């Protein structure tokens, strides 16, 4: 639907309008790599978190890898200039990804207790900074 909706590849503008796209790409890959490096550092096994992570992207958004992945698709829908698909992936990705976030969060709240409780009190905003 993004490819259908977006204008033809020669009609979309360039110059100083394609510099924001580069900004979005680089900030996405910074946030995702920082989140991954912070999450994988504290796990002894492949996915077994020893402690509670609250650093970098974790002090802004409780689930930063997920947000970074969606922001990748959002920048992608901005690239071919199709905002309608951006909104629809917002809806569907938010729904599924919130479901998995709830399952994961309830698991590690059960397994950790007060630490992730006060951490989630510190950062309520779960996916987008002060939007949700």
């Amino acid at each position: 639907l993004a490819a259908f909706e977006g204008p033809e590849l020669h009609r979309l503008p360039g110059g100083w309008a394609n510099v924001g796209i580069w900004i979005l790409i680089v900030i996405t890959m910074l946030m995702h790599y920082d989140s991954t490096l912070y999450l994988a550092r504290y796990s002894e096994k492949v996915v077994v978190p020893t402690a509670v992570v609250q650093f970098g992207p974790y002090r802004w958004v409780r689930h930063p890898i997920y947000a970074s992945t969606m922001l990748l698709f959002a920048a992608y829908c901005t690239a071919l200039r199709a905002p309608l698909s951006l909104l629809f992936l917002l809806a569907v990705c938010l729904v599924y990804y919130n479901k998995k976030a709830k399952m994961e969060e309830e698991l590690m709240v059960e397994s950790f207790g007060q630490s992730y409780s006060d951490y989630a009190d510190k950062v309520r905003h779960k996916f987008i900074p002060f939007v949700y």
Binding site: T36, V46, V47, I65, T69
Partner: protein, 50 residues
């Protein structure tokens, strides 16, 4: 003779126990040591992304 019994009858039970544990460990280790199904690379780790 004047020396009565020495260390114990229970320490002999403990050394018999550790002897039997090591014998059983060797027996288990001898016959179930080698079994291999596959070692395939896990390079579709979806739990990180998908």
């Amino acid at each position: 003779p004047m020396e009565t019994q020495i260390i114990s009858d229970d320490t002999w039970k403990l050394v018999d126990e550790i002897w039997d544990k090591k014998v059983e460990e060797i027996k288990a280790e001898a016959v179930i040591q080698i079994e291999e199904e596959k070692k395939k690379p896990q390079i579709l780790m979806a739990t990180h992304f998908f």
